[PDB]
Amino acid sequence: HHHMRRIHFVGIGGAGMCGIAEVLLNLGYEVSGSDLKASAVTERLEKFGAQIFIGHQAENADGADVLVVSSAINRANPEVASALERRIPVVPRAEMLAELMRYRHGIAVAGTHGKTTTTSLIASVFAAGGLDPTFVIGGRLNAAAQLGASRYLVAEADESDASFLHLQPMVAVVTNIDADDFNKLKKTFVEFLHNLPFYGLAVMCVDDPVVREILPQIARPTVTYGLSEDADVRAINIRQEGMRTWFTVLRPEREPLDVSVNMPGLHNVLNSLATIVIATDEGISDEAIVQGLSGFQGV
Amino acid sequence: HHHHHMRRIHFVGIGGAGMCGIAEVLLNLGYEVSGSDLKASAVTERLEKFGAQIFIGHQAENADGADVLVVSSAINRANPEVASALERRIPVVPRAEMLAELMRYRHGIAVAGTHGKTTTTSLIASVFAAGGLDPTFVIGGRLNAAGTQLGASRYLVAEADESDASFLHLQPMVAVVTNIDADHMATYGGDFNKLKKTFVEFLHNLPFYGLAVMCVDDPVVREILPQIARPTVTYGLSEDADVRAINIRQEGMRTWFTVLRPEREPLDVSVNMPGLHNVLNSLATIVIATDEGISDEAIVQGLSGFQGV
């Protein structure tokens, strides 16, 4: 009925691996893992319930329903070789990482520029609202308290990643689609957005020419943002004051809200606008949006 | 809306035989459903009794309040309901896309493969009904339920056509591949190779906790089996199938066979259709039924109760 009970990580002390294991533990799965040396990472994992093996031997994979490996599927590893011989699924860590969105309210931040900063800004505003998300930057899981505890999983989505077209987010942001086959690149972003359920939300920067271009092709609920006169969630009254930028944000069915972001540059007004759309969608108060954006120090 | 962005779905032409079933399921899921049609009918009256809001005629205002519009297929920008929706960035989707989407809300069992999808879908529905699971099932783009409340049960069984635009966007809990056959396409080319990758990508839409049900009698299914990084149960007459038919006795139009299953005693079943392919269709059904926890008696009675599509 449920065909994954025990997940085994080959190299579980690795920087991308330990976080995923911790989330799977918080989800209630049995997690085991092998690593070449014990560390604070593995010791923390066993206290969360991981079964830790030092060294690689075939028997370490016994009982596992699925194996997670760092990247390449290396049959020279005896744990992997045992799994493959017995037809146990072996998946790269990026695929298990994407899979985590199936269990959480996933917010995927895509686009050529601004993914990392916007992900960080969302995490800071959600923290100010007490929503304490787990968020993924550079393939590493962090919390804003065990990983995966929160209802929310905020993750950058890199268009060049093999897992990009397999995410199952509830909310997807596209900040821009930039040339830095471009037409195949556009279709990739359209297919990404159609992985939203019909009750999900596509958050689209209409200041970006290509995002605006593909907007009518997205058959999912949308909120647009930008400085553009037709953006649903719009920045006006922008006054750049040294290291902080003040602006008023217009939102559908809300009074104008005066905010500031504690970083200069017009692109950071855009990163903030994306964050505001998302925080607004989750019911975060004006006060928490103001504190998260203006209290922010950097990625 | 906030957090959940679909509350009301509007159907243009809701009285159509392909549309009314989808509306009924969405109503059973708890959504608000509205629909327009050129004339009232017994179909619209039934939908109104289930809670649908019915509009006769097409006027832009019929779409007011809708979060998503469903059209039969083509998106006709001359239709005032469609045009009003598009003007407001309300998604307008063909019914095949809304139909695919229903699997997200249900324990979806998608039956794929070049041959046998309809019979296997029907047999699974027959066995799940015998097990008291009251499945809704999809053959030919039409929704059906065990008896005559579409969508009431957790279970949704649907054929998955590789040539459909929604094929690589299904979210099943269980996926079947009966075979991957080139038919009149040649075997060792680029076209057939793209078809293989399509089936592999389809199976990778299973969650890691889902199940891939794979006919290893088929050469191409056997070929792609090592690429599937999902839990798999294989079936067939092959000696190495996890779930195997043996002791096959073809009796006119009725076929007896014994099924071997891991950790189970051999089970004698029969199907009321001739041909080894119907033994294969039955084996796929037994794998899924076994995985679901359905009793031997429901598997036997479900398979023998089926007379045809």
Ligand SMILES: Cn1nc(Nc2nc(N[C@@H]3c4ccccc4C[C@@H]3O)nc3[nH]ncc23)cc1C(C)(C)C
């Ligand atoms: C940290 N960071 N964050 C960004 N964020 C966004 N950048 C843009 N576009 C960009 C932009 C915006 C204004 C002037 C020049 C450019 C160039 C590019 O076009 N669009 C956006 N929409 N939502 C967010 C966002 C962009 C950047 C970089 C460019 C400093 C790496």
Ligand SMILES: Cn1nc(Nc2nc(N[C@@H]3c4ccccc4C[C@@H]3O)nc3[nH]ncc23)cc1C(C)(C)C
């Ligand atoms: C109704 N129906 N149902 C089927 N079901 C399955 N057919 C096959 N194989 C197929 C087969 C079988 C016998 C002769 C020719 C072919 C071609 C392909 O090879 N494999 C299977 N695995 N699970 C189920 C199943 C097949 C058929 C047809 C062929 C009568 C349309």
